[PDB]
Amino acid sequence: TSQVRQNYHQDSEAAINRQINLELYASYVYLSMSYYFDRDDVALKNFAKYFLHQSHEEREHAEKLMKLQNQRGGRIFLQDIKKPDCDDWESGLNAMECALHLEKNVNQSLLELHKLATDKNDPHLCDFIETHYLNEQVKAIKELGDHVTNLRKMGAPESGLAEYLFDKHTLG
Amino acid sequence: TSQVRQNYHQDSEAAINRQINLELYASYVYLSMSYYFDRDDVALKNFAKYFLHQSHEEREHAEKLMKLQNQRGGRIFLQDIKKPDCDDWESGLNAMECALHLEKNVNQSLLELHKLATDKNDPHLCDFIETHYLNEQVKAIKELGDHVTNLRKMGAPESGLAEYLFDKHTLG
Amino acid sequence: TSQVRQNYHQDSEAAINRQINLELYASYVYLSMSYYFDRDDVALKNFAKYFLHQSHEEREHAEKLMKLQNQRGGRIFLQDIKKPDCDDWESGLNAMECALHLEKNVNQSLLELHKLATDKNDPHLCDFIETHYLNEQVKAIKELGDHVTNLRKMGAPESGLAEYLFDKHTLG
Amino acid sequence: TSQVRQNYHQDSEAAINRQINLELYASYVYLSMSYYFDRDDVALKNFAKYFLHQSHEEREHAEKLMKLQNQRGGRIFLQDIKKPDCDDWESGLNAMECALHLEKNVNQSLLELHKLATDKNDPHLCDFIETHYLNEQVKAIKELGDHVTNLRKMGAPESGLAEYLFDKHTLG
Amino acid sequence: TSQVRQNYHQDSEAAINRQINLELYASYVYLSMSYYFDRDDVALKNFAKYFLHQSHEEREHAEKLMKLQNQRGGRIFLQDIKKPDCDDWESGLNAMECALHLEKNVNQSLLELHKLATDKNDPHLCDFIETHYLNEQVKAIKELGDHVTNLRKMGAPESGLAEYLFDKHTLG
Amino acid sequence: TSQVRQNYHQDSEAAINRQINLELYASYVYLSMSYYFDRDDVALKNFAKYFLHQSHEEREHAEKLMKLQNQRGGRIFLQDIKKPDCDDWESGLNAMECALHLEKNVNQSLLELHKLATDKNDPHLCDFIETHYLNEQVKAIKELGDHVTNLRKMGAPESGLAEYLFDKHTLG
Ligand code: NA
Ligand code: NA
Ligand code: NA
Ligand code: NA
Ligand code: NA
Ligand code: NA
Ligand code: NA
Ligand code: NA
Ligand code: NA
Ligand code: NA
Ligand code: NA
Ligand code: NA
Ligand code: NA
Ligand code: NA
Ligand code: NA
Ligand code: NA
Ligand code: NA
Ligand code: NA
Ligand code: NA
Ligand SMILES: [Zn+2]
Ligand SMILES: [Zn+2]
Ligand SMILES: [Zn+2]
Ligand SMILES: [Zn+2]
Ligand SMILES: [Zn+2]
Ligand SMILES: [Zn+2]
Ligand SMILES: [Zn+2]
Ligand SMILES: [Zn+2]
Ligand SMILES: [Zn+2]
Ligand SMILES: [Zn+2]
Ligand SMILES: [Zn+2]
Ligand SMILES: [Zn+2]
Ligand SMILES: [Zn+2]
Ligand SMILES: [Zn+2]
Ligand SMILES: [Zn+2]
Ligand SMILES: [Zn+2]
Ligand SMILES: [Zn+2]
Ligand SMILES: [Zn+2]
Ligand SMILES: [Zn+2]
Ligand SMILES: [Zn+2]
Ligand SMILES: [Zn+2]
Ligand SMILES: [Zn+2]
Ligand SMILES: [Zn+2]
Ligand SMILES: [Zn+2]
Ligand SMILES: [Zn+2]
Ligand SMILES: [Zn+2]
Ligand SMILES: [Zn+2]
Ligand SMILES: [Zn+2]
Ligand SMILES: [Zn+2]
Ligand SMILES: [Zn+2]
Ligand SMILES: [Zn+2]
Ligand SMILES: [Zn+2]
Ligand SMILES: [Zn+2]
Ligand SMILES: [Zn+2]
Ligand SMILES: [Zn+2]
Ligand SMILES: [Zn+2]
Ligand SMILES: [Zn+2]
Ligand SMILES: [Zn+2]
Ligand SMILES: [Zn+2]
Ligand SMILES: [Zn+2]
Ligand SMILES: [Zn+2]
Ligand SMILES: [Zn+2]
Ligand SMILES: [Zn+2]
Ligand SMILES: [Zn+2]
Ligand SMILES: [Zn+2]
Ligand SMILES: [Zn+2]
Ligand SMILES: [Zn+2]
Ligand SMILES: [Zn+2]
Ligand SMILES: [Zn+2]
Ligand SMILES: [Zn+2]
Ligand SMILES: [Zn+2]
Ligand SMILES: [Zn+2]
Ligand SMILES: [Zn+2]
Ligand SMILES: [Zn+2]
Ligand SMILES: [Zn+2]
Ligand SMILES: [Zn+2]
Ligand SMILES: [Zn+2]
Ligand SMILES: [Zn+2]
Ligand SMILES: [Zn+2]
Ligand SMILES: [Zn+2]
Ligand SMILES: [Zn+2]
Ligand SMILES: [Zn+2]
Ligand SMILES: [Zn+2]
């Protein structure tokens, strides 16, 4: 046992390792999207910038969970990072909808993690999740929902002018 | 023979003179395009600014090749600069497509020049082409491809609103 | 075919995709090492900082290759990022030796990539590899070799004082 | 007819197009001279700088005429830019004498243009020529005449010391 | 074998050691020239300054090759630095001509080195030579050729006034 | 005879030329040592920096003697610079001991030079040696003796930790 470990259940340690893999996977998905919008036949540079920033943020989320795992005396066990579901993300609206679905999946995983921490009476882990992850997820989901709403109302994906102007005025 | 000449093949010297003429011709094409967009019945000032900047850049490319020719002890032999293929460039999208075709032609000439320099075992000339011309061409081709993609997706040339907004938001 | 693609062989495109995966894998290996040294029972914070910086650098290498792939009109195809070979890196000296082995493997892959680009007469890709990857690899290998030499001469891994002082004075 | 065209005769439009070609030709002549003095066997860097500056100035003169053509609703029609009469300009004094002859030819063309504009009762075009071209030509001719006088009096072209010191003290 | 050595042929290592000796020899030649022009019976202080700067630059070239040798895991083997061919360099023009001959000899050695690196498929060494040595040599040869041309045209070596004024106005 | 020569014996001139060669040789020895410590299997960067600085200082000593030779109307006669006695300097302590031996040899040569200048009643040369060389040598010998003492007392060369810490704390 680690000399620092206290009130840290093995189930919580395993769930944190699963969350680390999920955040790394999300970072990879966002990287894939970013460079889709960098293609010469897509060419939406602010969509590309937006998703690259999301990718870097998800990497930071994963690293913060790894730091937590070490702080509590758990042991990090890394797994393969699976490739994203798509190479071709088809449009700015479709990528935003996929990002929204992904963020809601990550939020569900975080809520299950919080439930596990409550069940194991680990208030430090509960507070960690609440303080660093839950409101960030709610804000991200709300922002993506707003983006989807605006793109749909402007006429995307059938209006390329819509995605061009959204790229310039909302993401620029 | 020039007192500085060393490892500089006559075929390389001739190919550099041909490249000088090609860069001057490209500068002239871009000048023609720029002042097409300055016409009162076209009136896209940022298209005009974009192509004028390209014209000045191509003039600089030609002057750098002339400097190279003198550095290596070759002798510059100038030829007529032929007039561009068009007086009327018809639309922002058509001009961008013509610019893309022109840049790919210049890139092909530069690749043939690099092949000749390799065949003559002239590493200084190979490095000159790689360092000053090849990535510049790849970047220019990628930028023009992006512009064509965006103009097509916004509805150009049939949408004059598309070219107006592209002029304002991408080229402005 | 992409409207920008010119002198870009399908074999080169595939090799660039393989190199992207290798750089992402190296980033993951370095991330694993970094958080190994963050463990309470290892507790070498400057080793952790060193390998985290390497991880971020490898991520940048991968992103630059993705940008290249799009610049040339190739299409990025991502694959799973395999988990690193070890969870437990055993000592600062062992991690440095593993990093050296990894960097030499990456360098070998880059040399094979350069040979392929030469064989396909792609001077832009050759220059890209030379300018952005080859000397970086040589410098990284030399630095890691120096670190291994110093750690061995100070008495690592059997002297924990050696790794402590190396962490403070070389990596701090 | 252009919506802006007013009091702009077709003969004036044609004469402006001819003047554009003449200014571009003069720019090319000066470019040729500049890089003649950049040769290792000539090596007068301030002569080279002087004629390169003249080349850029003539390009600006041509562009101002193109802007005028569009302002008045005329249509620019470009022609081939003929190569200069010489590859080898033989000496600083000979190049200065050729430049003087060229500037006097351009001035004669501008005077014929002004006569045509007067004959067509186009006071805007007359004023344009007077304000932007006539005194510039007189100043250029006077400066070149001064340079020729000084080079002749110092002993050029037979005294290479004369051209060296003129390059240093007048053109430096 | 060195722990860092990878794709570094023994022939390349030997050729780098020969190039190190050649650069040190060139530094010595330039030192000899510099202090020739410092003699009371020669007394051209800017010629002396010019060649002293060249001597220091050649020393830096040699040190950069030694750094390369260590970076690649080769082993530096130093040899005697032979004394220069002359104690008495006879005139500014003669010294400049000797410097030009020396720089062309060094350039030939560098071209043979690049050919060897290409033959051994060592792209890092090829790029090192191209990036740090080849254009520097071309520039140095062009500058020395210009100096020789100007000194000859001003009347050197028979005109001591020529060398005096060249010392003041070109090298000052 | 030189127009400036006064009270400058031919024996003194010869001895100054020998001292020039000795200082250049010492510079070469220190250069060899510096790049020994730059090897990946030695990797003591502050030892390398220390000896490179010594090499540059010895080059300056030689140049000051050449300036003296010209000031007094003597004529510089350069000789081959012999390669150093070792390629492999074996340890920081061994290199410091070799440097101490070298500096004492140079000091002995300078003392013989001063004795010769006294015997020839050349007070300017005596003062030159005293002012620029003798105390510099005493200081260098004392510093090297201190370094040897400290390295021996810390346990070098058998303790690689000793040389590492000396490199960090005394030479850093
Ligand atoms: Na993907
Ligand atoms: Na979901
Ligand atoms: Na849910
Ligand atoms: Na045209
Ligand atoms: Na084309
Ligand atoms: Na092609
Ligand atoms: Na680009
Ligand atoms: Na791992
Ligand atoms: Na390896
Ligand atoms: Na290998
Ligand atoms: Na010409
Ligand atoms: Na005339
Ligand atoms: Na006239
Ligand atoms: Na000599
Ligand atoms: Na030669
Ligand atoms: Na040669
Ligand atoms: Na040696
Ligand atoms: Na001694
Ligand atoms: Na003694
Ligand atoms: Zn669990
Ligand atoms: Zn954008
Ligand atoms: Zn990040
Ligand atoms: Zn974050
Ligand atoms: Zn996240
Ligand atoms: Zn821990
Ligand atoms: Zn912590
Ligand atoms: Zn665990
Ligand atoms: Zn693990
Ligand atoms: Zn998968
Ligand atoms: Zn040819
Ligand atoms: Zn505008
Ligand atoms: Zn320009
Ligand atoms: Zn340019
Ligand atoms: Zn160009
Ligand atoms: Zn030349
Ligand atoms: Zn030049
Ligand atoms: Zn020619
Ligand atoms: Zn010509
Ligand atoms: Zn034509
Ligand atoms: Zn392949
Ligand atoms: Zn620390
Ligand atoms: Zn990064
Ligand atoms: Zn990086
Ligand atoms: Zn990498
Ligand atoms: Zn693309
Ligand atoms: Zn790009
Ligand atoms: Zn592909
Ligand atoms: Zn993919
Ligand atoms: Zn795996
Ligand atoms: Zn290169
Ligand atoms: Zn200490
Ligand atoms: Zn007319
Ligand atoms: Zn000059
Ligand atoms: Zn201009
Ligand atoms: Zn002007
Ligand atoms: Zn003009
Ligand atoms: Zn108009
Ligand atoms: Zn206007
Ligand atoms: Zn017209
Ligand atoms: Zn036209
Ligand atoms: Zn012609
Ligand atoms: Zn060899
Ligand atoms: Zn002077
Ligand atoms: Zn130096
Ligand atoms: Zn240098
Ligand atoms: Zn050199
Ligand atoms: Zn080494
Ligand atoms: Zn190094
Ligand atoms: Zn060797
Ligand atoms: Zn040696
Ligand atoms: Zn000799
Ligand atoms: Zn003596
Ligand atoms: Zn150090
Ligand atoms: Zn020095
Ligand atoms: Zn000194
Ligand atoms: Zn000394
Ligand atoms: Zn003297
Ligand atoms: Zn003096
Ligand atoms: Zn003597
Ligand atoms: Zn000598
Ligand atoms: Zn020897
Ligand atoms: Zn005294």
From Swiss-Prot, chains A, B, C, D, E, F:
InterPro entries: Ferritin (IPR001519), Ferritin-like (IPR012347), Ferritin-like_diiron (IPR009040), Ferritin-like_SF (IPR009078), Ferritin_CS (IPR014034), Ferritin_DPS_dom (IPR008331). It is found in: Cytoplasm; Lysosome; Cytoplasmic vesicle, Autophagosome. Keywords: Acetylation, Cytoplasm, Cytoplasmic vesicle, Iron, Iron storage, Lysosome, Metal-binding, Neurodegeneration, Oxidoreductase, Phosphoprotein. GO terms for biological process: immune response; intracellular iron ion homeostasis; iron ion transport; negative regulation of cell population proliferation; negative regulation of ferroptosis; negative regulation of fibroblast proliferation. Expressed in the liver. Oligomer of 24 subunits. There are two types of subunits: L (light) chain and H (heavy) chain. The major chain can be light or heavy, depending on the species and tissue type. In the human liver, the heavy chain is predominant. The functional molecule forms a roughly spherical shell with a diameter of 12 nm and contains a central cavity into which the insoluble mineral iron core is deposited. Interacts with NCOA4; NCOA4 promotes targeting of the iron-binding ferritin complex to autolysosomes following starvation or iron depletion. This is Ferritin heavy chain. It comes from Homo sapiens (Human).
